[PDB]
Design a protein around this ligand. Structure first.
Ligand SMILES: OC[C@@H](O)[C@@H](O)CO
Lengths: 12, 223, 214, 54, 63
């Protein structure tokens, strides 16, 4: 899964 | 209360230099290790450097050695990260954290973090357009409206509604990178249909990199 | 260096369930392992340190254990606010290193989206571009198909989607789909339509407007 | 603060590098001041940047 | 190449969780079975039913 700056969350 | 606050992050050209600060309060950095840790899409959480301000001993990640230096000023209770010869791969949120505080052998406080963007692209402020409520944005006695925050660079932008007084029913969507190389996002809020026209709805948009601050009143269209 | 391997990468469970996530060190790290939580818009927050010890203020439903080079984090009774990413980290040898993370999501009942559409603003139309926004509010599960049609022609390559992380209150998602055209193209066509397919709907829902109508 | 003859030498090398711009030159000098233990590494990275900008 | 193995975790009380493992097919496979074995310590003996050529698993625990 890849970290996104905008959410500070992993997106799978 | 223990707090760490990073500052200094921003857009910088490849090959360029930036200096980050980490201001500590509620404890003395002489009593702990201070670390810099970064977080990126490419490498996730990645330790950068540490210092023990009591004796000045430092350690660095192999990938930043020679290019970054960590330091601390105990009299200002502040630590620093000098960042030179920057590369695309250094684009990340930079956090400072403490370790060994109160005898806890883990990073038990982290700052909010500061974004560093390494890019040759230019700063650009967003245009802010209303998403007006209408007969096509209502159902069940509730209505949706919003703001489209389009074509900005770099990150970040912040969006609030009615100066932060309105939070219920708000969805601010993740920023999307457009093919143009500029970001865009929408923020929407759902409200009672009956409140439209009596309650003012304003989206407060801030893009500090461009010093853009917009307060946009959103209302139903004319006819 | 020491690498930390976390499994699974994604775990989805219902409120009240017991959930277990794991972390394997590539070599001996003793008990020098910490677990962090990262909620939406947040910084990493310490949960467990030295493999099994609960940080102050962390709910007792969290626990950690070690077996050799295998480490586990368990939540005994999953709560809505536990929806987050979880990271392990060894501090046995320099460099300290982190696992790639495990995303933990909440399962809940199916809910169909509320579907809304927004024409380009007159303000935006003053410039040379038109953005048309389709909004899907408060649905579950995340899977949804959004297709654009302009004068009944299926659009492709000219829209982008963005989806929120799970809502703190009801564990749902919301999604925006934005269709981008030149002003010239927008003024050349009449009917703009977003069609939404989702498990909670008995058949697809189309939301549309004619350019020029109030 | 004061410096020894090695530290002074590293300063002198960076000061003289012809292909650094002034933001870069002073960033590296700042690094030498920040962490004396890293002088050789810092000098090496300054050299690499200077060479690539020839 | 990179694949995602999707796993249903079916517990003896009828509760269901879902998980994903990513990596090469061989790595993701190994990690799914390793995770099953770990859960089995608490939730009882597991059995794993592979479908979709190995890329989806149903893992049931005896309780
Ligand atoms: O961190 C702020 C972020 O949410 C916005 O910049 C949108 O990505």
């Amino acid at each position: 899964c890849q970290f996104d700056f905008s959410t500070x969350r992993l997106r799978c | 209360e223990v707090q760490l606050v990073e500052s200094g992050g921003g857009l910088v050209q490849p090959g360029g230099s930036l200096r980050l600060s980490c201001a500590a309060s509620g404890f003395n950095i002489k009593d702990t290790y201070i670390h810099w840790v970064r977080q990126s899409p490419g490498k996730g959480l990645e330790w950068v450097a540490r210092i023990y301000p009591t004796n000045g001993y430092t350690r660095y990640a192999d990938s930043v050695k020679g290019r970054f230096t960590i330091s601390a000023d105990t009299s200002k209770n502040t630590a620093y990260l000098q960042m030179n010869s920057l590369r695309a791969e250094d684009t990340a949120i930079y956090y400072c954290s403490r370790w060994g505080g109160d005898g806890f052998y883990a990073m038990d406080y982290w700052g909010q973090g500061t974004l560093v963007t390494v890019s040759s692209a230019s700063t650009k402020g967003p245009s802010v357009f209303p998403l007006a409520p209408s007969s096509k944005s209502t159902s069940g006695g509730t209505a949706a409206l919003g703001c489209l925050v389009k074509d900005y660079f770099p990150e970040p932008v912040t969006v609030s509604w009615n100066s932060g007084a309105l939070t219920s029913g708000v969805h601010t969507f993740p920023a999307v990178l457009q093919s143009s190389g500029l970001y865009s996002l929408s923020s929407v809020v759902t409200v009672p249909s009956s409140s439209l026209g009596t309650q003012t709805y304003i989206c407060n948009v801030n893009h500090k990199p461009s010093n853009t601050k917009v307060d946009k009143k959103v209302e139903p269209k004319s006819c | 260096d020491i690498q930390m391997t976390q499994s699974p990468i994604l775990l989805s469970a219902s409120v009240g369930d017991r959930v277990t996530i794991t972390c394997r060190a590539s070599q001996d790290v003793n008990t020098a392992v910490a677990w962090y939580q990262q909620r939406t818009n947040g910084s990493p927050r310490l949960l467990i340190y030295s493999a099994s010890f609960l940080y102050s203020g962390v709910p007792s439903r969290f626990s950690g254990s070690r077996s050799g080079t295998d480490f586990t984090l368990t939540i005994s009774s999953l709560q809505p606010e536990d929806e987050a990413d979880y990271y392990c980290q060894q501090h046995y040898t320099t460099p300290p290193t982190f696992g790639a993370g495990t995303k933990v999501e909440i399962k809940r009942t199916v809910a169909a989206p509320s579907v809304f559409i927004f024409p380009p603003s007159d303000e935006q139309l003053k410039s040379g571009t038109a953005s048309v926004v389709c909004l899907l509010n408060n649905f579950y599960p995340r899977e949804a198909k959004v297709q654009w049609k302009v004068d009944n022609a299926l659009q492709s390559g000219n829209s982008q989607e963005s989806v929120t992380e799970q809502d703190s209150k009801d564990s749902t998602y919301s999604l925006s789909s934005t269709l981008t055209l030149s002003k010239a193209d927008y003024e050349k066509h009449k009917v703009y339509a977003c069609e939404v397919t989702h498990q909670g709907l008995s058949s697809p829902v189309t939301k549309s407007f004619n350019r020029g109508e109030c | 603060g004061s410096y020894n003859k090695d530290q002074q030498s590293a300063f002198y090398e960076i000061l003289n590098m012809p292909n650094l711009n002034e933001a870069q030159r002073n960033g590296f000098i700042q690094s030498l001041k920040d962490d004396p233990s890293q002088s050789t590494n810092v000098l090496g990275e300054a050299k690499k940047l200077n060479e690539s900008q020839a | 190449s990179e694949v995602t193995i999707k796993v249903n975790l079916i517990f003896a009380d009828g509760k269901i969780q879902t998980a994903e493992f990513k990596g090469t097919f061989e790595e993701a496979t190994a990690e799914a079975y390793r995770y099953a074995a770990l859960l089995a310590k608490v939730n009882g003996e597991y059995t794993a039913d592979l479908e979709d050529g190995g890329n989806h698993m149903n893992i049931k625990f005896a309780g």
